[PDB]
Amino acid sequence: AIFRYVNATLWSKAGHFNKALSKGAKTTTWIWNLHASAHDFDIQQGSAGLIARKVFSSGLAHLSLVFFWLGGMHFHGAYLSNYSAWLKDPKSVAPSSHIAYSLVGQDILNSYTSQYFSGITITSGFFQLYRSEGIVTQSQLKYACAASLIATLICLSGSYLHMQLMSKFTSFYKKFQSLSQSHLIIMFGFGSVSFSAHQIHEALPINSLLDSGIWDPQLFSAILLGTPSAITGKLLNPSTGSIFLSQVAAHHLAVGIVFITLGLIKWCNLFFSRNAILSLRLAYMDYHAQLSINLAVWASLSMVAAHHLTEIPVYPYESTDYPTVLCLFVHHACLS
Partner 1 sequence: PWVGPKKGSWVKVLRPESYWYQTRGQVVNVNQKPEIKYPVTVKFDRVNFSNVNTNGFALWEVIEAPAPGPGEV
Ligand X SMILES: CC1=C(/C=C/C(C)=C/C=C/C(C)=C/C=C/C=C(C)/C=C/C=C(C)/C=C/C2=C(C)CCCC2(C)C)C(C)(C)CCC1
> Please, which of residues 1-60 interact with partner 1 by CB under 8 A?
23, 26-27
Residue 32 interacts, among partner 1, ligand DGD, ligand CLA, none and using kind-specific CB cut-offs from 5 to 8 Å, with none
The distance of closest approach from Cβ of residue 70 to ligand X in the complex, given in angstroms and rounded to an integer, is 6
Residue 176 interacts, among partner 1, ligand X, ligand DGD, none and using kind-specific CB cut-offs from 5 to 8 Å, with none
Instruction: DSSP for 122-190, please give it.
Output: P-S-HHHHHHHHT--SHHHHHHHHHHHHHHHHHHHHHHHHHHHHS-TT--GGG-HHHHHHHIIIIIIII
> Please, which of residues 128-147 interact with ligand DGD by CB under 6 A?
none
The distance of closest approach from Cβ of residue 26 to partner 1 in the complex, given in angstroms and rounded to an integer, is 5
Q: Which is nearer to ligand X, 85 or 184 (CB)?
A: 184
Q: Which helix (H) or strand (E) holds 119?
A: strand 118-119
The distance of closest approach from Cβ of residue 218 to ligand CLA in the complex, given in angstroms and rounded to an integer, is 28
The binder of ligand CLA chosen from 16, 88, 142, 183 (CB under 6 A): 183
The binder of ligand CLA chosen from 21, 49, 284, 333 (CB under 6 A): 284
Q: Which helix (H) or strand (E) holds 62?
A: helix 48-79
Collapsing DSSP to helix, strand or coil, 328 comes out as helix
CB burial of residue 232 (10 Å; 0-12, 13-18, 19+): middle
Q: Is 168 in the site for ligand CLA (CB under 6 A)?
A: no
Collapsing DSSP to helix, strand or coil, 45 comes out as coil
Q: With b meaning 16 or more CB within 10 Å and e meaning fewer, what string describes 118-134?
A: bbebbbbbbbbbbbbbb
Residue 118 interacts, among ligand DGD, ligand X, ligand CLA, none and using kind-specific CB cut-offs from 5 to 8 Å, with none
The binder of ligand CLA chosen from 129, 147, 200, 236 (CB under 6 A): 129
* Residue ranges in contact with ligand DGD by CB under 6 A: 1, 3, 150, 153-154, 157, 161, 165
